[PDB]
Every structure is written in structure tokens, then in C-alpha cells.
């Protein structure tokens, strides 16, 4: 029966467990550096080795 219902169900779920850290392979070095720059900006606990 067609219908959007809220209920308690006992069903079997497949294994879609993927799509994590996989997009870091297709990128080149430059785009990877851009992503790392974004990550450094958004996370205060990440720092990159410098020379200054």
C-alpha cells in the first residue's frame, strides 16, 4: 500500500558502506592542496609544516 508511515520495522539493509576518503585519489596535487587549505581553515587543530 502506498503511504508515508512512521512505524517500527524489522527489515534487512544492504551494505552501502563506501564513499569516504575516495575523492582524494581522483584529484591532482593542486586541487588536493586546495582541499587541505579548506580543511586547515575549518579545523583549528590542523596545522601544516612551514618554513618562516
Amino acid at each position: 500500500k502506498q503511504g508515508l508511515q512512521l512505524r517500527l520495522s524489522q527489515q534487512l539493509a544492504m551494505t552501502p558502506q563506501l564513499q569516504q576518503a575516495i575523492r582524494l585519489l581522483q584529484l591532482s596535487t593542486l586541487e588536493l592542496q586546495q582541499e587541505l587549505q579548506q580543511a586547515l581553515e575549518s579545523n583549528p587543530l590542523l596545522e601544516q609544516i612551514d618554513t618562516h
Binding site: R7, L8, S9, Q10, Q11, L12, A13
Partner: protein, 247 residues
């Protein structure tokens, strides 16, 4: 501890005593406030399995989509969420007694699920590949006429014969005119001592009013009225006006 002063109640007590050596499932039919739970527990106590666990279930509180899981159990990995195997209610009552209350509130889909467990008692767990053999003594209580439901189409014909091996009909308190007074006094000792009151009896007019007043709710309504009268009393007895406004 209870009151069984009525001759019909004495006959029912004798029937309960006579099935001490029996194990077939028993059905109880009657109205509200008659003592279906009391009769079930008395049968359990007089049965040889009194020391065995006694599990009471209401069939209206189990979710629709997990009905098979609760009464049969499952092994780990049977479904997404079965991280640890569980034992069902029937295996909890393995060797003991299982009492189903309000059994007339069971959907027709869930009624056919209990055809083989009552007869043979053998069932396969959800994800269980080995048959399980148990010994269960089954008691059931209903508040409506089971025969009418069977003849009307709201109850399975097979299930009535599976459960209706020994049928006990508890009479209403209205026909038990000789049980109101012994109960009404007892409830008094149940209430005043619990409330530290000074009521030690009932007036003759109050007793006559209670006898004349119809107990549609039976013992439950009588207890509620007596408790209210004790709560709103003032003196060493209960006069007519203390309960006239209620009954």
C-alpha cells in the same frame, strides 16, 4: 484471603480445585470487576507449577510488526538489529504458566500465529533452524462473549477450540448479593488502616443501599466507592449520606 461466600463462587472454587491435576489451557469469561486475574492466580497457586514462573501478557500492547519476534525470539543476524539473540515470552514461560489478558483484542492476523504453539508447543525462532520443544500451561481471560465473536467472524473458529478446553464463567456481583457485604467490610480494613482512619463499621441503611445499588463495575466500583466514603468520612462509622451522593 479473597471472598468466595456466594454458592456459585464456591462452585467455581471447587472447579478450580478439581483441575489441580490438569494441564489443558483454561478460558475465563465474564464482565469487568469479576476477578479474572484473581481466578487465574488462584489456579496458578493450586497448580503443581505454582513455584514455576508465571508470565502475564496483554495482547494489545505488542507492536504490530514485532509480534513474531516477541513471542518466538530470534538469533543474532536474523534481521538488521539482531546483534544479540533474545528469548521470547513463551520460552520465559517454559515449564511455567502463561496468562493472556484481554485476548479478545487480538487482530485476526495475529490469532492464526498461535495455532500450533497451543497444540504442540513447537516453533522455530526467527533465524532459528532447529525446532524448540517446550511445556507451557495456558490461561486466557476475556471480557466479552467468545462464542458471539466466533459466530460473528471477529475471532478464529480454530482458536476457540484450541483455548476453550475448560471454560469458567464468573457471575456478576449483582447475582452475588451475598458477597457485597463480606467484601465491603474487607475493603474497609484495606483502607482505614492504610489511611489511619477511625471507621470500624457500616450503618444498616448504608448496607441496604449497597445491596440495592447495582454494581455495574462490580468489585472495582465497590472498592472505589468505599475508598471515597472512607476518604470523605467524619465519625466512627459511615452514615447513609456519606455514600448516598455516590451510589
Amino acid at each position: 484471603e479473597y471472598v468466595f461466600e456466594s454458592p456459585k463462587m464456591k462452585e467455581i472454587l471447587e472447579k478450580i480445585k478439581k483441575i489441580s491435576c490438569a494441564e489443558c489451557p483454561v478460558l475465563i469469561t465474564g464482565e469487568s470487576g469479576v476477578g479474572k486475574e484473581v481466578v487465574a492466580r488462584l489456579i496458578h497457586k493450586l497448580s503443581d507449577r505454582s513455584k514455576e514462573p508465571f508470565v502475564a501478557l496483554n495482547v494489545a500492547s505488542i507492536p504490530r510488526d514485532i509480534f513474531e519476534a516477541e513471542l518466538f525470539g530470534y538469533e543474532k543476524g536474523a534481521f538488521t538489529g539482531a546483534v544479540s539473540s533474545k528469548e521470547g515470552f513463551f520460552e520465559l514461560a517454559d515449564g511455567g504458566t502463561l496468562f493472556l489478558d484481554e485476548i479478545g483484542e487480538l487482530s485476526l492476523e495475529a490469532q492464526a500465529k498461535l495455532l500450533r504453539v497451543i497444540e504442540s508447543g513447537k516453533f522455530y525462532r526467527l533465524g532459528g533452524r532447529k525446532e524448540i520443544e517446550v511445556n507451557v500451561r495456558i490461561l486466557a481471560a476475556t471480557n466479552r462473549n467468545i462464542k458471539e465473536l466466533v459466530k460473528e467472524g471477529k475471532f478464529r473458529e480454530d482458536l476457540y477450540y484450541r483455548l476453550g478446553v475448560i471454560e469458567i464463567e464468573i457471575p456478576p456481583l449483582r447475582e452475588r448479593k451475598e458477597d457485597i457485604i463480606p467484601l465491603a467490610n474487607h475493603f474497609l480494613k484495606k483502607f482505614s488502616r492504610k489511611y489511619a482512619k477511625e471507621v470500624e463499621g457500616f450503618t444498616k441503611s448504608a448496607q441496604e443501599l449497597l445491596l440495592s445499588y447495582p454494581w455495574y463495575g462490580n468489585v472495582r466500583e465497590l472498592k472505589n466507592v468505599i475508598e471515597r466514603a472512607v476518604l470523605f468520612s467524619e465519625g466512627k462509622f459511615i452514615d447513609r449520606g456519606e455514600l448516598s451522593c455516590l451510589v
